[PDB]
Design an enzyme around this catalytic site. Sequence first.
Site, PDB file in Angstrom:
ATOM      1  N   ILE A  15       0.848  -1.184   0.000  1.00  0.00           N
ATOM      2  CA  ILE A  15       0.000   0.000   0.000  1.00  0.00           C
ATOM      3  C   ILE A  15       0.890   1.244   0.000  1.00  0.00           C
ATOM      4  O   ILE A  15       0.399   2.359   0.163  1.00  0.00           O
ATOM      5  CB  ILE A  15      -0.980  -0.013   1.192  1.00  0.00           C
ATOM      6  CG1 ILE A  15      -0.260   0.118   2.540  1.00  0.00           C
ATOM      7  CG2 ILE A  15      -1.874  -1.244   1.150  1.00  0.00           C
ATOM      8  CD1 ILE A  15      -1.108  -0.198   3.742  1.00  0.00           C
ATOM      9  N   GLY A  16       2.198   1.041  -0.200  1.00  0.00           N
ATOM     10  CA  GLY A  16       3.164   2.125  -0.148  1.00  0.00           C
ATOM     11  C   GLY A  16       4.581   1.621  -0.343  1.00  0.00           C
ATOM     12  O   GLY A  16       5.445   2.484  -0.579  1.00  0.00           O
ATOM     13  N   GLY A  17      12.518   0.457   1.609  1.00  0.00           N
ATOM     14  CA  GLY A  17      11.364  -0.122   2.328  1.00  0.00           C
ATOM     15  C   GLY A  17      10.048   0.056   1.574  1.00  0.00           C
ATOM     16  O   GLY A  17       9.927   0.900   0.692  1.00  0.00           O
ATOM     17  N   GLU A  18       9.070  -0.778   1.929  1.00  0.00           N
ATOM     18  CA  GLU A  18       7.709  -0.655   1.438  1.00  0.00           C
ATOM     19  C   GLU A  18       6.794  -0.603   2.654  1.00  0.00           C
ATOM     20  O   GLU A  18       7.236  -0.897   3.766  1.00  0.00           O
ATOM     21  CB  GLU A  18       7.305  -1.837   0.544  1.00  0.00           C
ATOM     22  CG  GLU A  18       8.340  -2.239  -0.498  1.00  0.00           C
ATOM     23  CD  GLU A  18       9.497  -3.067   0.041  1.00  0.00           C
ATOM     24  OE1 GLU A  18       9.234  -4.094   0.700  1.00  0.00           O
ATOM     25  OE2 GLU A  18      10.657  -2.675  -0.187  1.00  0.00           O
ATOM     26  N   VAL A  19       5.544  -0.193   2.426  1.00  0.00           N
ATOM     27  CA  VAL A  19       4.491  -0.332   3.412  1.00  0.00           C
ATOM     28  C   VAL A  19       3.509  -1.363   2.878  1.00  0.00           C
ATOM     29  O   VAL A  19       3.078  -1.272   1.730  1.00  0.00           O
ATOM     30  CB  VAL A  19       3.784   1.003   3.742  1.00  0.00           C
ATOM     31  CG1 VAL A  19       2.733   0.813   4.822  1.00  0.00           C
ATOM     32  CG2 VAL A  19       4.760   2.096   4.141  1.00  0.00           C
ATOM     33  N   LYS A  32       5.519  -1.201   7.901  1.00  0.00           N
ATOM     34  CA  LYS A  32       6.578  -0.509   7.199  1.00  0.00           C
ATOM     35  C   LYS A  32       7.891  -1.246   7.427  1.00  0.00           C
ATOM     36  O   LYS A  32       8.223  -1.517   8.566  1.00  0.00           O
ATOM     37  CB  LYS A  32       6.701   0.927   7.704  1.00  0.00           C
ATOM     38  CG  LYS A  32       7.680   1.760   6.901  1.00  0.00           C
ATOM     39  CD  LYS A  32       7.857   3.155   7.458  1.00  0.00           C
ATOM     40  CE  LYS A  32       6.681   4.055   7.183  1.00  0.00           C
ATOM     41  NZ  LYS A  32       6.989   5.461   7.538  1.00  0.00           N
ATOM     42  N   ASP A 125       4.930  18.843   8.673  1.00  0.00           N
ATOM     43  CA  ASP A 125       4.509  18.335   7.373  1.00  0.00           C
ATOM     44  C   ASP A 125       3.033  17.970   7.446  1.00  0.00           C
ATOM     45  O   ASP A 125       2.621  16.956   6.884  1.00  0.00           O
ATOM     46  CB  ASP A 125       5.351  17.112   6.986  1.00  0.00           C
ATOM     47  CG  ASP A 125       5.366  16.696   5.524  1.00  0.00           C
ATOM     48  OD1 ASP A 125       5.010  17.523   4.665  1.00  0.00           O
ATOM     49  OD2 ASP A 125       5.725  15.519   5.285  1.00  0.00           O
ATOM     50  N   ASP A 143       2.622  10.089   9.721  1.00  0.00           N
ATOM     51  CA  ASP A 143       3.879  10.616   9.205  1.00  0.00           C
ATOM     52  C   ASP A 143       4.660  11.337  10.310  1.00  0.00           C
ATOM     53  O   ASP A 143       4.676  12.557  10.401  1.00  0.00           O
ATOM     54  CB  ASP A 143       3.636  11.391   7.913  1.00  0.00           C
ATOM     55  CG  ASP A 143       3.110  10.486   6.810  1.00  0.00           C
ATOM     56  OD1 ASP A 143       2.059   9.842   7.027  1.00  0.00           O
ATOM     57  OD2 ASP A 143       3.771  10.392   5.749  1.00  0.00           O
TER      58      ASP A 143
HETATM   59  C1  LIG Z   1      -4.040   2.676   3.634  1.00  0.00           C
HETATM   60  N1  LIG Z   1      -4.193   2.515   5.060  1.00  0.00           N
HETATM   61  C2  LIG Z   1      -3.188   2.701   5.920  1.00  0.00           C
HETATM   62  N2  LIG Z   1      -3.454   2.488   7.224  1.00  0.00           N
HETATM   63  C3  LIG Z   1      -2.457   2.756   8.077  1.00  0.00           C
HETATM   64  C4  LIG Z   1      -1.188   3.187   7.658  1.00  0.00           C
HETATM   65  C5  LIG Z   1      -0.073   3.466   8.500  1.00  0.00           C
HETATM   66  C6  LIG Z   1       1.129   3.871   8.017  1.00  0.00           C
HETATM   67  C7  LIG Z   1       2.290   4.127   8.912  1.00  0.00           C
HETATM   68  C8  LIG Z   1       2.491   5.386   9.502  1.00  0.00           C
HETATM   69  C9  LIG Z   1       3.605   5.623  10.316  1.00  0.00           C
HETATM   70  C10 LIG Z   1       3.873   6.974  10.898  1.00  0.00           C
HETATM   71  F1  LIG Z   1       4.774   6.965  11.847  1.00  0.00           F
HETATM   72  F2  LIG Z   1       4.352   7.814  10.029  1.00  0.00           F
HETATM   73  F3  LIG Z   1       2.863   7.437  11.443  1.00  0.00           F
HETATM   74  C11 LIG Z   1       4.499   4.600  10.560  1.00  0.00           C
HETATM   75  C12 LIG Z   1       4.317   3.365   9.990  1.00  0.00           C
HETATM   76  C13 LIG Z   1       3.230   3.136   9.179  1.00  0.00           C
HETATM   77 CL1  LIG Z   1       3.038   1.546   8.550  1.00  0.00          CL
HETATM   78  C14 LIG Z   1       1.303   4.037   6.565  1.00  0.00           C
HETATM   79  O1  LIG Z   1       2.359   4.391   6.024  1.00  0.00           O
HETATM   80  N3  LIG Z   1       0.193   3.748   5.763  1.00  0.00           N
HETATM   81  C15 LIG Z   1       0.356   3.875   4.313  1.00  0.00           C
HETATM   82  C16 LIG Z   1      -0.039   5.239   3.831  1.00  0.00           C
HETATM   83  C17 LIG Z   1      -0.063   5.349   2.336  1.00  0.00           C
HETATM   84  C18 LIG Z   1      -0.532   6.739   1.951  1.00  0.00           C
HETATM   85  N4  LIG Z   1       0.463   7.516   1.230  1.00  0.00           N
HETATM   86  C19 LIG Z   1      -1.035   3.345   6.271  1.00  0.00           C
HETATM   87  N5  LIG Z   1      -2.014   3.113   5.390  1.00  0.00           N
END
Ligand SMILES: CNc1ncc2cc(-c3cc(C(F)(F)F)ccc3Cl)c(=O)n(CCCCN)c2n1
Length: 273
Positions: A15-16, A17-19, A32, A125, A143
């Site tokens: 849905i997004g 290293g990768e996420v 992540k 941000d 973020d």
């Molecule tokens: C789609 N639903 C979904 N649900 C929950 C999350 C949580 C994180 C996240 C956020 C942080 C921190 F710290 F930044 F808050 C850390 C780690 C993670 Cl995994 C994340 O990166 N994504 C992807 C966002 C893609 C949008 N461009 C999520 N997506």
Amino acid sequence: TTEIHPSCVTRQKVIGGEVYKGMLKEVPVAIKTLKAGYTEKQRVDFLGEAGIMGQFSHHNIIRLEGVISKYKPMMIITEYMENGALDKFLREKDGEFSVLQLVGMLRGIAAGMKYLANMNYVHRDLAARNILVNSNLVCKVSDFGLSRVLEDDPEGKIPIRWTAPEAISYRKFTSASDVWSFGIVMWEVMTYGERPYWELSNHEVMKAINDGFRLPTPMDCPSAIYQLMMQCWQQERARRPKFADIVSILDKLIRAPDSLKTLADFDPRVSIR
Ligand SMILES: CNc1ncc2cc(-c3cc(C(F)(F)F)ccc3Cl)c(=O)n(CCCCN)c2n1
């Protein structure tokens, strides 16, 4: 932070290293990863993000489930937000909510930001792209990456057109520059994800702002909501509301919802005879 054993986590879809979206031993999670060969700085920034998130416990701040740090690849595991990023969500749901729902989203974001500010955290941000939305329409600040630079800096890119003048001109990021950003987020929400300042260049935006111009009223925007976002964009930081003020005002509007029926006049860019 809770250490999670890798056997308890399954990755499923990027849905997004990768996420990834995945499952945690079962609840849905976002995951992540940090890939092999990461530097010391990367590790400190990556685990740093988890450390900061672990310090927070608030409805409107993404919840950390835990980390995998004893095994590689290292992982941060958060709650999963079913509707994803707020900017894309608004654009794909254009016109589908009530004004009260939109204002309730903004109250949630402001409550999250008040908490961050009072916990002595400056986000730097804040933008709809960095807010996530769950299946209860709850908006949560996300973020908390440590390593952020302002875009176009001569010396993750923070965009100019969400950033307060003082943060651009002399690198002064504070909870008051976050309030500026929140004003831009108000405009994003009320326009269902319109891009602030449209096709103006960064230089053009900065020049406009310094000359006193501000974003115009969204269509069908409550007068009180437009007034509040305009106050967020005061050049003088001391004249901006604090998040405490913003939460107070939004709570009052929501509790007396007829207050939102009074609309700011919309300046139509094209009229049809
Ligand atoms: C789609 N639903 C979904 N649900 C929950 C999350 C949580 C994180 C996240 C956020 C942080 C921190 F710290 F930044 F808050 C850390 C780690 C993670 Cl995994 C994340 O990166 N994504 C992807 C966002 C893609 C949008 N461009 C999520 N997506």
